[PDB]
Amino acid sequence: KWECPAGYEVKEGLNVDFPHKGMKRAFIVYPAKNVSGPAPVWVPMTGSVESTNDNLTVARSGANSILADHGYTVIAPVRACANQDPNIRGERCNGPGSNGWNWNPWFEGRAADPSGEHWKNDEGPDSSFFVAMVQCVGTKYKLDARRLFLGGISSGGTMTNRALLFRSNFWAGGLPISGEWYVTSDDGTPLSFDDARAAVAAAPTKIHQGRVGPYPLPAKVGPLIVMTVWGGEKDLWNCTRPDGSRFLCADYRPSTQAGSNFFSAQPDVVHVACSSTHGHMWPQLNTQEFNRWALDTLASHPKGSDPRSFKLTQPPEGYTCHVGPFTGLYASA
C-alpha cells in the first residue's frame, strides 16, 4: 500500500506542495531513530491556536518530534488553513469552518446547518490526505503497517476521532486528547452546545451519534486501540467573538465520554479511558513520560491483535487510566 501521487519525492523535514484532491498540502517528517526495520508511526495533530511547529517542538505543546528519538517515525500534517506554513498559530485557522465544516483548523466535523449534510458520509479532505501522506512517506522510510497511529489535541483530537471512524481499516489506533464528538440526536439532528451537553448528562452510558463522524456511526469498525484523554474539570474551551468577548463553546467531559462509549462497545477495539487534571491543552504533568507511555501502549496492540491479550501498564503520575468507557465523569444512575 506504499505509494506516492504523481511521482512525489518525500524528504526528511518539511514537505510542501503535496497534491491531494486539488489542494497542495504540507507535512513534516522526523524519521525514527535507533530502529532496525519497519518503524511504528505517530501522526500528531495540533489544535486551533498552537502551530504544527509548536506541537512538534515546544514542551508545553507536547514536543511531539521527540518521539522520533523514542523509535517512532513522526509524520505531522500542517492544517489546510495555515497555507503550508508550519509556524501559523491561530491566524486564519482559529474560527468557524466553511463549505459545510464546523471548525476551520481541520475538516473534523460537519456543520450544524444544512450545508454540513454532504459530510455525513464523506470523510473529508483531511482524513483522506493523512492516509495518502503516510502511504507516501512509507515509500522512503520503512514503516510498520500494523502500527500506524494518529492523535492530537483539541480540534486535532476531534480530527483523530473522525479519522478513526472513517478509516478504521487503515489506522491501528489513535490518541484523541480532549477532542469533540459534537453530539447529535439519534436521528442525526444537530444539537446546540447546551443541548448536546445535556444529552450526554441525561444518558451517560449510551452511544451517542455525533457530527464528528459518519451518520449514522458505523455499526462495526476495523481493529483499533483508542486512548481517549480527558483533562478534568478545566477541560473546557471559551470561543472568542469578533469583538473579543469570550464565551463557553465546548466542554470535553461529554465528548470524551461519548467517544469512550462508542469505542468501548466495539468488539475489535481496545479503548483506554485516561483522565488527568491539566485542563484543555497537551498533557502537562510529566509530559514526555506520558507521550512515551501512551505511544508505547498503542504500539503494544498492533492492528489485528486480540483485545483479550492486551495488558495495560501503569501510566505516569498525574494520570488515571483503565480499559473501557469513562466511569468517573457522570454519577451512576
Curated annotation (Swiss-Prot):
Gene3D superfamilies in the cross-refs: alpha/beta hydrolase (3.40.50.1820)
Function: Catalyzes the hydrolysis of 4,6-nonanedione, a beta-diketone compound. Also mediates hydrolysis of oxidized polyvinyl alcohol (PVA) in the second step in the degradation of polyvinyl alcohol. Not active toward the monoketone structure.
Domain of life from the UniProt record: Bacteria
Similarity section: Belongs to the peptidase S9A family.
Organism of provenance: Pseudomonas sp
Active site, per annotation: S154, S260
Name of this chain's protein: Oxidized polyvinyl alcohol hydrolase
Reactions accelerated catalytically: nonane-4,6-dione + H2O = pentan-2-one + butanoate + H(+)
Enzyme Commission number(s) of this protein: 3.7.1.7
Covalent S-S links between cysteines: none
GO molecular function terms listed in the Swiss-Prot or TrEMBL record: beta-diketone hydrolase activity
Keyword entries, A-Z: Hydrolase, Signal
Assembly information from the UniProt record: Monomer.
